[PDB]
Structure formats: C-alpha cells, structure tokens
Design a protein around this ligand. Structure first.
Ligand SMILES: Nc1ncnc2c1ncn2[C@@H]1O[C@H](CSCC[C@H](N)C(=O)O)[C@@H](O)[C@H]1O
Ligand SMILES: Nc1ncnc2c1ncn2[C@@H]1O[C@H](CSCC[C@H](N)C(=O)O)[C@@H](O)[C@H]1O
Ligand SMILES: [Mg+2]
Ligand SMILES: [Mg+2]
Lengths: 180, 291, 291, 184
DNA sequence: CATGTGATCTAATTAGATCGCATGG
DNA sequence: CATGTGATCTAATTAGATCGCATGG
C-alpha cells in the first residue's frame, strides 16, 4: 500500500455495514456534502444480499463493519455481524491485479465474548487492536502501527460493562481526496 | 460446466475432508477406483480417527481441530482438488429441541468449512478442476438453510438414502459436483430392504427403518417404539454389523478401539449413507486417475 | 490303533460337541477341509450360541443343556464319529481361590462328558472308527487330574498354545486321537508373536502375552500390570479383533449380538487355541471325507 | 430276567463297595459259611482301582453301592460315592450276550440332597424307591416291582436331621433268592 | 517368585426411556 | 399425525482393581 500523490487522490467509495458512518466520515471530509450521486452505500440488513449486488454497487475502496453499541437492539446473535461482514468482504474485493488501494475495517463495541473474538481474529487473519474503547480489525496500516494507550482489560471487564475511532478513520486521507 | 480431461492428463486426486468422521469420503473414493494422492482429514474424535487410520492403514493425514487450520496450512497441504465436509448438526437438526442454530453452539463450525473452502479455492487465472461438497440435515430452520446457501453461494439438492439403502435419511448436499440433481438410481450391490442387512437366522419386520441417529431410540421403529428384528421368535434390536450394512459401510468397519454397541452407533448415526456419497462422487472418476 | 480307511470308503464326520462354547471344534474341522455331516452342540450361553449359528449359518444343531441329554437322544442324534468337549474350569482352575473341585459346583459337569461318552461309544463288536477328546486346565488339583484320568481311562497330554500362538495357554488333552503325544510344530500361517496379531499403527511391548482369562486383568502383563500395547505413544490394552488373532479365530468372529469388549473377552477366555485344536484334529482327514 | 430253576442256581458273586454287607448276605443266606475263597469282594476307597482290577476279581453277579449312613466322618463329598459307583459298575458288566443274571443296586441313607439326587437318577437311568429310611436305585425287578408304603417327604425332610440300614434293605436283598443258591 | 479357561465389591459408565415440535402427509 | 446426523437424568451394568496361593523355576 504505497502512498499516492495528492493530485491523483480520487475520492473514497465506501461500504458501511450495520452502522452508518456517513456523518462521521463527512466531518473528516472524505465525501462531498453535496451528495448528488452517493459516495457511500449503507445496508442495515445483509441477509438477502448477493455478490451480484455488491459488484453492481460500484467498486469499493473501503468496507466498514461494526457491531451494535450496547444498545440491546439486537434481534441477532453477535457472531452474525462478523460472519456476514466476512461474506460481503470477499464479494467487494477486486481482482488480484490491484488497480488501486483497498482497505477494510471491522470494529466491535464490546459485544463479542472471548469465544467470538478468537473466531473474529481468525477469520480476519489478524489480532485486534483496542483504541481507548472499541476493538478494531483492519488492514489500514496506521491503525496497526500507531501504538494507542495499552492498558489491560482485566479492569475494564466490569468497568466498561466515537472520536477515538474517528481518529483511526483519519489515516485514509493519505490515500483519497480531502474535502473542506 | 467444467471441460473434460484426457485419460492421460488425469492425476491422482487431492482431498481436504473437514469433519471427516469415519473416513466415509476416503472409503467411497477408493471404492470407485480413484487414485487418492492425498487425503487430509480434520477430526477430533479419537474413535473416529482410530477407524480411519486402522481401516485405511495410514493413508489419511489427520490434522486435528479445524479451527486450528491456518491459511498457510491450506497452501502447505495443498493444492486440493476436492473439499468435502459435513459439520455437526446437533445444534441444527430438529430432533434436538434445544438447538442453538448455526450462529451459536456447534453450528458455527459450518463457517469453518466456508472459511477453509475459500482458502482452498484456486486463485483467479487457474482453470484447473476443483470440486467441493457440503452435507447437513434437512430438519434445520429455514433461516439456517438460507444463510448456509448464501455463504456457499449455492442451493442444496436433497438426496434421501431411502432410494439406495434400507433407511430413511434425507440430507441436503451443497456442492458443485457434476450431476448432483440427476435422478438417484439404485445399484445391484445396494441392499435396499432391511432383510438384506440382517444376519443369519434373523427376520426383519419392516422393509425400511427410521432415520438412524446416535441414540438407541431411533432403532425402535414407529410411535409405539417397536423392535425392528425377530430372531429365535424373540424381538431384538439391530446389531452393529447390521447398522453398518444399512449405512452401506463394509461389515465390521467400526470394530475398532474395543467400541461397544453404543459407541459404534454414535459414529454411524452421524455418518453419511455410503451409496448416496457414491452417487455423488461417481462423476469424479472422469477427472482423476484410474486404479 | 485305528486301521486306515481307503479314501473312497470315507464318509462325512458326525460330531457331538459338549460345552461347545463358540463352536471352536466345528470351525477347526471346516478349515481342515473335513466334510462335516452332523455337528450336535450342547451349549447354554445365548451369546455363544449366537456366534455359532451366525458364523456357521445354521449348520450346527443346538441341544441346549447337557444335563438334559438322554440315552435316547444319543441314539437318535447318533451315530457320532467324534465326541469333543471342554468342561467349565471355574471350579477346577487354580486361578479361583474359592474353587469347589471336581465333585461340587461346576466341576461335576465333567461327568456329563463321561456319561454321554459311554452312551456314544460303539457297542461291543463295532470296529468302526471312533474318536473323542476332552480338554481342561493344567492348574488343577492333583486329585481332580487323577480322577478325571480314571473316569476316562486315559492320561492327558499337555499342549501349550505358546508354541503355535502368541499367548501362554497350558491345557490338558485327554483323548484317543491319532498322534496326540507327537511334537507340536508351528505352521506357515500361525501368528507366533503379539505384533503379528495387532492392528495397524500399534506396537507390541512383549513378544508373547500371559494366559488370557475372561477377566480384563489378564490383559495387563506381569506382576506390575503393564498395558501390552503402545499406540500413538500411549499405553493401551488389546482390542477384541487382536484377542481373536491371538487365539487363532478369524477376525470379527465374536462381533455378534451387540457384544462389547467385556462379553467378547469372556467368550474367548474360555475358548480353545485354534492352532492347538487344528494340531489335534489334523490326523482326522485320513478317516473322513474332504471338501 | 427269566427265572432260573433251583437245581442250577449258582451262588452269588458279590462286589460290595463303601459299605460291607457280608454279614447281611450271610444272614439272609446268599453266602456259604465255610467260605474259604470268598464270593464277596469289599473295597472302601476305589480311587485307585482300574478296569483290570475289577476284571481280575472275577465275573460278578451283584454290584452293591451305599453311602455312609448319617455320619459326619466323611472325607468324600456326597456325590463322590455315586460317580465312583457308576464308574466301577461299567467295569463289572459282562459281554453283551448276558449268560446269567446281572444285578446292581445303590443305596443312599438320606445323604444325597436334591441336586445330587437328580444326578444319581440320570446316571443310573432310574428314579429311586424309598424304603422306610433309605433310597434305593436297583435293576432288581421285585425292588422296582413291589410297592412299599408311600411316604410324605415333606415330613421326612426334617426327619433327616434327627439322626444328628440292615433290616430295611434286607427286604431288598430278599428277591435275589429266586436267582441264586439258598444256603442255611 | 512370578503365575492363573475366576469371583468379588465398588466406581465409572453406559442403556433406555422420556422429552420435544415444525411440518408435510 | 408421525417424524428426527439429540440432550437429559436416572437405572442397570459394566470396568477395574484387589484377592488368592501351590508350584516349578
Ligand atoms: N472442532 C472440530 N474440528 C474438527 N472436527 C470436528 C470438530 N467438532 C466436531 N468434529 C467432528 O465432525 C464430525 C461431524 S459428524 C460427520 C461425520 C462424517 N461426515 C462421516 O461421514 O462420518 C464428527 O465426527 C465430529 O467428531
Ligand atoms: N449345563 C451346561 N450344559 C451345556 N453347556 C454348559 C453347561 N454349563 C456351562 N456350559 C458351557 O460350557 C462351556 C465351557 S467353556 C468351554 C468353551 C468351548 N470349549 C470353546 O471352545 O469356546 C461354556 O461356554 C458354558 O456356557
Ligand atoms: Mg447444487
Ligand atoms: Mg491321551
């Protein structure tokens, strides 16, 4: 994932899954406020989506995944959001010959138990990083490079039970258009 | 959908069997005359592995728990020409009233098959042959059957063992094998009635038996739970060697590890109907080496 | 002592097997190539009878209890060319501290063999061939071995199965068979040491195992109770199919009647070493028809 | 068993084992006083006797068997007296063509239990007869022909323990006169 | 001084019955 | 209206270890 010159940085085209980050990605200027043709596709229920849908929804540069934020508005087990996120990711991934940068991200708002976490990091091929807090699996290099504040969760198990994960949306600027 | 291969360009088949059980896949392949170059089995039951190693004399590489198979393993152990599996259904089938679906309990293990299937898939630009198959019960929630078909991007074909065995066994079969929707035809060596599966001096009450599970109650037939066999005038349950003939396995196939009757039914109860699998793997011998 | 019979004058053999067990006698005769015209078996254990009827497909006539056989039955079921039997030794063998000897408990069943032998004996003036054999343990009171030899009017010959099998089995053999005192010689197909009887991927610690009884403790060898087999670097006991190969029976011979490990070892612990019995019955081919 | 005329009735050749009855047979008069070579052989522990021994002791006309009467001084198990009696009996019987009469009998002075009783009847091919008491297995016809007074065994069951043999079966030896010499 | 055609008592362990209901027949 | 790639709890039934000693080695 080499850095791209500023005069060539096309604007993003992201897919937001179960949680819409439009207003949050707008604030960081990744998309024109004038929406006219959408630059962000949002789907709340993936159950009936096929690969032919994601392919027809235009090529994607970012695929976002997120669990419900302890809202108890969950008619679905927590591992569902992970398995369905992995299913669409392969649908949205372009051909092996890479024409451009492709990034993906899945965040957990502290709803996955230890059993689901070991499944998540295994399906996403990397151990998660905790940003003080939410858990993050992503191929974005700065998220897995910038050492956030590291304190064990032996305290935040009973203690714990969006601006910080907005700062990890930021390192995508080096790759796409900046709007002010 | 995939072109034909000359009888000379046919190389031995390389199989990744997940949730291998008692090596039904290997047994069927070797009974069809197909050269098996490599057979990687993911299994965690000691007795199941004992069956596969003893009956097949160490031709099967056992690779314990599927959740510990990495992407490097699929490429080290690869390439694979065939990926077959049937995951546990105790949290999927309707016979368990406390089932947890495919997202909790042991139903998650389906996604392990889905996960390793994409690893084993030939990358784009590789027109080499590749076949896969996934088996499970028909008595699952339609929400489960829907999601399974979504992840595999394929719809299942149901094949009941009633057509080629002496037992009802209706199962779903996702896959891309040649001619899976074709009409199931019976063979001359298929034991179609329960009498053909019994021993000497034993009499069968029915021509067909209930779907055989791991529990001993599925041997008692009907709503009044009647014994299926009569010998010496007295009623009696099926024998292990008879259960094997019902499933299409060779006789004494599960006579290992000092297993009693209960253990041997536990392995057979969740296995595959051999003649059904043979009907599915039969068109593979036109893509891999003879023997 | 018995004159030779011309080959064309030979007729199929008629056998009376008392305490038949798992039909060891009939098995030996059939594998020797001797045509068996009639095989009357006195046995009371259902599982034992199940083995004999199933493995030999109803060629054996079972006559349930030996103490209920009458003189009329011997004449009706007769004539007999061979009268074989092994009396229960649970009250004779030295392995039982509370054994009751020959005149109480189960030892007195020997006299049933003595009683029915005289019934089957050819009457005075019948020079037709007639052979018999009685087997029992060596570890037996001297008074019992004395009295048994008196009632049979013959002295026993000890044949330890160690010479033709992988196990210690020292047994006494009363009889009038041709060449019983002859030196026991090993055959080309006798599995002489334990490793020849084990399954794939199993290693034998010893070359020869101690005497196998009906209890599971006799599988653990020595005075420090060692497991005789190593598998996957773990100590393990013998398997039923391995016990069968040790005794010389065909594989899966006792895979009958849903029997588990315990039941199958109980039937084999009582049985005869097949290669020993073949040694005894071998010179019978020159007196009866072949097939 | 045809009756034999008196002028050719030879004296008995008796084999008595476990219990000697020469005093009985002499009193009834089957054995002659100046006996000098006896016609009654008596052996106690037959454990080391062979067929040649019985054949050496000459042809026998009567083989008697008996259990120790109501005694605790028995080294042998009760069934031992029966099996050994049955063994020597086959040694005594002559060639198939029976020239003269051959009799045998076995007496139990209430020593054999039920389990041992069915064994005796099976081996001796005959159900016993009770004489008020002792049980008698015998091929002697008048001992199987005549009927003694029937006895309720349920009362005689507890009467066996009251003990805590010569005049009863003397009526059993009686009908042997018709086949052998009468001495007085 | 290690050995045994078994019986025993107790601890594991297994057998068998009951439970369970969406769903085509 | 009968069916089922099972889990449960409790009831029979094993599995396992200890027992036992005359005797050649
Ligand atoms: N985590 C895991 N990893 C690998 N195998 C597993 C597993 N969990 C369960 N299994 C095995 O998966 C099998 C499913 S039953 C299917 C058996 C097989 N299809 C046959 O024909 O016999 C069971 O034998 C079970 O032991
Ligand atoms: N009363 C009786 N009548 C007939 N058989 C009996 C009996 N009592 C015991 N038996 C049988 O006698 C056998 C003695 S063990 C000998 C088994 C046989 N020699 C073999 O080759 O296997 C046992 O199987 C037992 O079931
Ligand atoms: Mg299909
Ligand atoms: Mg001899």
């Amino acid at each position: 994932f080499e850095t791209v010159p500023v005069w060539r940085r096309q604007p993003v085209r992201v897919l937001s899954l179960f949680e819409d980050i439009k207003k949050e990605l707008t604030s960081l200027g990744f998309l024109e406020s004038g929406s006219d043709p959408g630059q962000l596709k949002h789907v709340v229920d993936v159950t009936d989506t096929v690969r032919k849908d994601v392919e027809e929804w235009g090529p994607f540069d970012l695929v976002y995944g997120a669990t419900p934020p302890l809202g108890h508005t969950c008619d679905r087990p927590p591992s569902w959001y992970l398995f369905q996120f992995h299913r669409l990711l392969q649908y949205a991934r372009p051909k092996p010959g890479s024409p451009r940068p492709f990034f993906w991200m899945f965040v957990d708002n502290l709803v996955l138990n230890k059993e689901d976490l070991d499944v998540a990091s295994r399906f996403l091929e990397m151990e998660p990083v905790t940003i003080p807090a939410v858990r993050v699996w992503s191929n974005i290099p700065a998220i897995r490079s910038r050492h956030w504040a590291l304190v064990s969760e032996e305290e935040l198990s009973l203690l714990a039970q969006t601006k910080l994960v907005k700062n990890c949306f930021l390192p995508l600027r080096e790759y796409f258009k900046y709007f002010s | 959908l995939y072109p034909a291969i000359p009888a000379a360009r046919r190389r031995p088949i390389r199989v990744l069997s997940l949730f291998d059980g008692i090596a039904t896949g290997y047994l069927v392949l070797k009974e069809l005359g197909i050269k098996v170059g490599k057979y990687v089995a993911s299994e965690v039951c000691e007795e199941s592995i004992a069956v596969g190693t003893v009956k097949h004399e160490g031709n099967i590489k056992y690779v314990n728990d599927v959740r510990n198979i990495t992407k490097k393993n699929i490429e080290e152990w690869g390439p694979f020409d065939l990926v077959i599996g049937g995951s546990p259904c105790n949290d999927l089938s309707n016979v368990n009233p406390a089932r947890k679906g495919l997202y909790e309990g042991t139903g998650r293990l389906f996604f392990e098959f889905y996960h390793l299937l994409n690893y084993s898939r030939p990358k784009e630009g590789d027109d080499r042959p590749f076949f896969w198959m996934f088996e499970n019960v028909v008595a699952m929630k339609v929400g489960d059957k829907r999601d399974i078909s979504r992840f595999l991007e394929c719809n299942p074909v149901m094949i009941d063992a009633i057509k080629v065995s002496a037992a009802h066994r209706a199962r779903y079969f996702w896959g891309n094998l040649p001619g899976m929707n074709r009409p199931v035809i019976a063979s001359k060596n298929d034991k179609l009635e329960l009498q053909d599966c019994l021993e000497y001096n034993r009499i069968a009450k029915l021509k067909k038996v209930q779907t055989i599970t791991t529990k001993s109650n599925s041997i008692k037939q009907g709503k009044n739970q009647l014994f299926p066999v009569v010998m010496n005038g007295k009623e009696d349950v099926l024998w292990c060697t008879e259960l094997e003939r019902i499933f299409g396995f060779p006789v004494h196939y599960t006579d290992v590890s000092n297993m009693g009757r209960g253990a041997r039914q536990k392995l057979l109860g969740r296995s595959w109907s051999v003649p059904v699998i043979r009907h599915l793997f039969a068109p593979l011998k036109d893509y891999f080496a003879c023997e």
